[PDB]
Design an enzyme around this catalytic site. Structure first.
Site, PDB file in Angstrom:
ATOM      1  N   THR A 287      -0.472   9.106   0.286  1.00  0.00           N
ATOM      2  CA  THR A 287      -0.187  10.479   0.709  1.00  0.00           C
ATOM      3  C   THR A 287      -1.436  10.968   1.422  1.00  0.00           C
ATOM      4  OG1 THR A 287       1.257  10.894  -1.178  1.00  0.00           O
ATOM      5  CG2 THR A 287       0.493  12.812   0.021  1.00  0.00           C
TER       6      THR A 287
ATOM      7  N   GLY B 257       3.689  16.213  -5.410  1.00  0.00           N
ATOM      8  CA  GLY B 257       4.896  15.456  -5.751  1.00  0.00           C
ATOM      9  C   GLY B 257       5.323  14.437  -4.717  1.00  0.00           C
ATOM     10  N   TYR B 258       4.636  14.387  -3.575  1.00  0.00           N
ATOM     11  CA  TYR B 258       5.009  13.462  -2.504  1.00  0.00           C
ATOM     12  C   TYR B 258       4.775  11.988  -2.877  1.00  0.00           C
ATOM     13  CZ  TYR B 258       5.877  17.374   0.712  1.00  0.00           C
ATOM     14  OH  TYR B 258       6.435  18.486   1.326  1.00  0.00           O
ATOM     15  N   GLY B 259       3.658  11.694  -3.540  1.00  0.00           N
ATOM     16  CA  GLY B 259       3.350  10.334  -4.010  1.00  0.00           C
ATOM     17  C   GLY B 259       4.419   9.764  -4.926  1.00  0.00           C
ATOM     18  N   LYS B 260       4.806  10.536  -5.937  1.00  0.00           N
ATOM     19  CA  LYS B 260       5.948  10.198  -6.794  1.00  0.00           C
ATOM     20  C   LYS B 260       7.280  10.052  -6.047  1.00  0.00           C
ATOM     21  CE  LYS B 260       5.144  13.246 -10.169  1.00  0.00           C
ATOM     22  NZ  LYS B 260       5.828  14.203 -11.108  1.00  0.00           N
TER      23      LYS B 260
ATOM     24  N   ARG C  63      -1.190  15.980  -4.362  1.00  0.00           N
ATOM     25  CA  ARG C  63      -1.009  16.841  -5.545  1.00  0.00           C
ATOM     26  C   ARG C  63       0.198  17.775  -5.457  1.00  0.00           C
ATOM     27  NH1 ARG C  63      -5.627  16.135  -8.460  1.00  0.00           N
ATOM     28  NH2 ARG C  63      -4.028  16.359 -10.106  1.00  0.00           N
TER      29      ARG C  63
ATOM     30  N   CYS D 110       0.838  -1.217   0.000  1.00  0.00           N
ATOM     31  CA  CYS D 110       0.000   0.000   0.000  1.00  0.00           C
ATOM     32  C   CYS D 110       0.853   1.239   0.000  1.00  0.00           C
ATOM     33  CB  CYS D 110      -0.960   0.073   1.193  1.00  0.00           C
ATOM     34  SG  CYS D 110      -2.086  -1.336   1.365  1.00  0.00           S
TER      35      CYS D 110
ATOM     36  N   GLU E 131       1.814  -4.000  -5.720  1.00  0.00           N
ATOM     37  CA  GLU E 131       0.742  -4.988  -5.602  1.00  0.00           C
ATOM     38  C   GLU E 131      -0.514  -4.604  -6.414  1.00  0.00           C
ATOM     39  OE1 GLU E 131      -0.114  -6.195  -1.570  1.00  0.00           O
ATOM     40  OE2 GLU E 131      -2.197  -6.721  -2.096  1.00  0.00           O
TER      41      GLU E 131
ATOM     42  N   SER F  78       2.692   8.166 -14.217  1.00  0.00           N
ATOM     43  CA  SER F  78       3.437   9.420 -14.241  1.00  0.00           C
ATOM     44  C   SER F  78       4.879   9.235 -13.799  1.00  0.00           C
ATOM     45  CB  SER F  78       2.742  10.452 -13.365  1.00  0.00           C
ATOM     46  OG  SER F  78       3.564  11.567 -13.195  1.00  0.00           O
TER      47      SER F  78
HETATM   48  C1  LIG Z   1      -0.570  -0.341  -4.485  1.00  0.00           C
HETATM   49  C2  LIG Z   1      -1.666   0.444  -3.815  1.00  0.00           C
HETATM   50  O1  LIG Z   1      -1.644   0.790  -2.639  1.00  0.00           O
HETATM   51  S1  LIG Z   1      -2.998   0.862  -4.726  1.00  0.00           S
HETATM   52  C3  LIG Z   1      -3.432   2.128  -3.572  1.00  0.00           C
HETATM   53  C4  LIG Z   1      -2.963   3.487  -4.083  1.00  0.00           C
HETATM   54  N1  LIG Z   1      -3.175   4.483  -3.067  1.00  0.00           N
HETATM   55  C5  LIG Z   1      -4.366   5.035  -2.842  1.00  0.00           C
HETATM   56  O2  LIG Z   1      -5.309   5.000  -3.638  1.00  0.00           O
HETATM   57  C6  LIG Z   1      -4.482   5.761  -1.515  1.00  0.00           C
HETATM   58  C7  LIG Z   1      -5.156   7.130  -1.720  1.00  0.00           C
HETATM   59  N2  LIG Z   1      -4.430   8.048  -2.611  1.00  0.00           N
HETATM   60  C8  LIG Z   1      -3.253   8.617  -2.318  1.00  0.00           C
HETATM   61  O3  LIG Z   1      -2.700   8.558  -1.223  1.00  0.00           O
HETATM   62  C9  LIG Z   1      -2.629   9.405  -3.439  1.00  0.00           C
HETATM   63  O4  LIG Z   1      -3.681   9.713  -4.376  1.00  0.00           O
HETATM   64  C10 LIG Z   1      -1.428   8.730  -4.151  1.00  0.00           C
HETATM   65  C11 LIG Z   1      -0.372   8.163  -3.183  1.00  0.00           C
HETATM   66  C12 LIG Z   1      -1.915   7.564  -5.037  1.00  0.00           C
HETATM   67  C13 LIG Z   1      -0.815   9.844  -5.003  1.00  0.00           C
HETATM   68  O5  LIG Z   1      -0.336  10.862  -4.139  1.00  0.00           O
HETATM   69  P1  LIG Z   1       0.050  12.370  -4.527  1.00  0.00           P
HETATM   70  O6  LIG Z   1       1.004  12.859  -3.485  1.00  0.00           O
HETATM   71  O7  LIG Z   1      -1.212  13.169  -4.770  1.00  0.00           O
HETATM   72  O8  LIG Z   1       0.808  12.154  -5.932  1.00  0.00           O
HETATM   73  P2  LIG Z   1       1.673  13.256  -6.752  1.00  0.00           P
HETATM   74  O9  LIG Z   1       1.372  14.654  -6.318  1.00  0.00           O
HETATM   75  O10 LIG Z   1       3.100  12.767  -6.765  1.00  0.00           O
HETATM   76  O11 LIG Z   1       1.112  13.036  -8.226  1.00  0.00           O
HETATM   77  C14 LIG Z   1       1.561  11.964  -9.053  1.00  0.00           C
HETATM   78  C15 LIG Z   1       0.793  11.964 -10.360  1.00  0.00           C
HETATM   79  O12 LIG Z   1      -0.514  11.434 -10.110  1.00  0.00           O
HETATM   80  C16 LIG Z   1      -1.515  12.367 -10.524  1.00  0.00           C
HETATM   81  N3  LIG Z   1      -2.678  12.379  -9.580  1.00  0.00           N
HETATM   82  C17 LIG Z   1      -2.624  12.232  -8.235  1.00  0.00           C
HETATM   83  N4  LIG Z   1      -3.855  12.336  -7.693  1.00  0.00           N
HETATM   84  C18 LIG Z   1      -4.723  12.567  -8.698  1.00  0.00           C
HETATM   85  C19 LIG Z   1      -6.189  12.780  -8.847  1.00  0.00           C
HETATM   86  N5  LIG Z   1      -7.007  12.776  -7.768  1.00  0.00           N
HETATM   87  N6  LIG Z   1      -6.678  12.970 -10.121  1.00  0.00           N
HETATM   88  C20 LIG Z   1      -5.896  12.983 -11.218  1.00  0.00           C
HETATM   89  N7  LIG Z   1      -4.571  12.800 -11.132  1.00  0.00           N
HETATM   90  C21 LIG Z   1      -3.942  12.594  -9.943  1.00  0.00           C
HETATM   91  C22 LIG Z   1      -0.785  13.716 -10.467  1.00  0.00           C
HETATM   92  O13 LIG Z   1      -1.317  14.806 -11.254  1.00  0.00           O
HETATM   93  C23 LIG Z   1       0.616  13.368 -10.918  1.00  0.00           C
HETATM   94  O14 LIG Z   1       0.618  13.347 -12.357  1.00  0.00           O
HETATM   95  P3  LIG Z   1       1.548  14.315 -13.279  1.00  0.00           P
HETATM   96  O15 LIG Z   1       2.959  14.011 -12.844  1.00  0.00           O
HETATM   97  O16 LIG Z   1       1.166  13.846 -14.656  1.00  0.00           O
HETATM   98  O17 LIG Z   1       1.191  15.734 -12.942  1.00  0.00           O
END
Ligand SMILES: CC(=O)SCCNC(=O)CCNC(=O)[C@H](O)C(C)(C)COP(=O)(O)OP(=O)(O)OC[C@H]1O[C@@H](n2cnc3c(N)ncnc32)[C@H](O)[C@@H]1OP(=O)(O)O
Ligand SMILES: [Zn+2]
Length: 246
Positions: free
Chosen positions: A143, A151-154, A149, A140, A174, A187
């Site tokens: 962020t 850059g922390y997820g990346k 939104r 899992c 996974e 991304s």
């Molecule tokens: C293996 C697994 O765990 S599957 C579970 C995945 N995790 C989840 O769903 C938990 C809930 N979500 C989250 O915590 C977050 O949405 C994460 C971890 C998936 C992404 O975290 P962020 O910190 O927002 O990501 P970050 O800012 O680095 O963005 C990465 C890319 O994803 C895109 N993105 C992130 N959230 C969204 C959204 N809601 N809608 C559209 N695009 C999105 C970003 O625009 C970026 O793309 P770009 O580089 O083309 O601009």
């Protein structure tokens, strides 16, 4: 969906999903969480009393990476059970499913923080199976909403691949990936591969620790597919600051 509001340090959080916290804590206006140990309770007063005895001020485990205000802490789910168990309860508020939420033994947890004069603030994390037959380098990933939104997820994904590199392995998240997971990975994979930009996908995979099937689905997405004679043809982590032993 059972919990309407979480208070975690300076933030109010709005859960997306049900999380199996004690049922008597699911009918409150606000579920209060210690931002350092992730302990949950029914009121602000008990939190303030708690914050008086709570030593922490950061996540447990070892600080295996530090660069500027950003740290990563490596936490054994077996050695630090109640913290990891508390983390999983919070995470489930933002995950559709979280299999084995109650048993943290099988997992390592990599918790990313932002540091200021008030302490190390949890920004997000990823977990990882200790043993995976499917080469899953992330189980899992999360962020927390106030930091999304940005850059922390990346950054979390990149760190997951730095760990695979040291292990001399390829890894992949996974499956199934949530749609937010896929958008993030797509991304990260895209930026990584374009950054590499003749090279083979085998070589891309060896350099990045990305599985070949993920490089291929990405080149497909980028309209960069070139199949020649059986073969597909074409905020940062400073790895010097990483102190990780598989
Ligand atoms: C293996 C697994 O765990 S599957 C579970 C995945 N995790 C989840 O769903 C938990 C809930 N979500 C989250 O915590 C977050 O949405 C994460 C971890 C998936 C992404 O975290 P962020 O910190 O927002 O990501 P970050 O800012 O680095 O963005 C990465 C890319 O994803 C895109 N993105 C992130 N959230 C969204 C959204 N809601 N809608 C559209 N695009 C999105 C970003 O625009 C970026 O793309 P770009 O580089 O083309 O601009
Ligand atoms: Zn605490």
């Amino acid at each position: 969906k059972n919990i309407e509001c979480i208070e975690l340090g300076r933030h109010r959080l709005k859960p997306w999903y049900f999380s199996p916290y004690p049922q008597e804590l699911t009918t409150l206006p606000v579920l209060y969480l210690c931002e350092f140990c992730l302990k949950y309770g029914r009121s602000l007063k008990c939190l303030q009393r708690h914050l008086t005895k709570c030593d922490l001020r950061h996540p447990p485990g070892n600080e295996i990476y530090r660069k500027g205000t950003i740290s990563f802490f490596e936490i054994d789910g077996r050695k630090n059970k109640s913290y990891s168990q508390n983390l999983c309860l919070l995470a489930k508020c933002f995950l559709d499913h979280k299999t084995l939420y109650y048993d943290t033994d099988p997992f390592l947890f990599y918790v990313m923080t932002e540091y200021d004069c008030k302490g190390f603030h949890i920004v997000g994390y990823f977990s990882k199976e200790k043993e995976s037959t499917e080469d899953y380098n992330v189980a899992c990933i999360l962020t927390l909403p106030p930091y999304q939104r940005r850059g922390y997820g990346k950054l979390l994904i990149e760190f997951s691949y730095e760990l695979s590199k040291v292990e001399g392995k390829t890894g992949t998240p996974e499956k199934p990936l949530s749609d937010l997971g896929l958008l993030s990975y797509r991304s990260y994979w895209s930026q990584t591969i374009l950054e590499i930009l003749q090279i083979t996908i085998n070589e891309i995979s060896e350099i990045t620790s990305i599985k070949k099937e993920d490089v291929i689905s990405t080149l497909q997405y980028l309209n960069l597919i070139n199949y020649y004679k059986g073969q597909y043809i074409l905020l940062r982590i400073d790895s010097k600051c990483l102190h990780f032993t598989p």
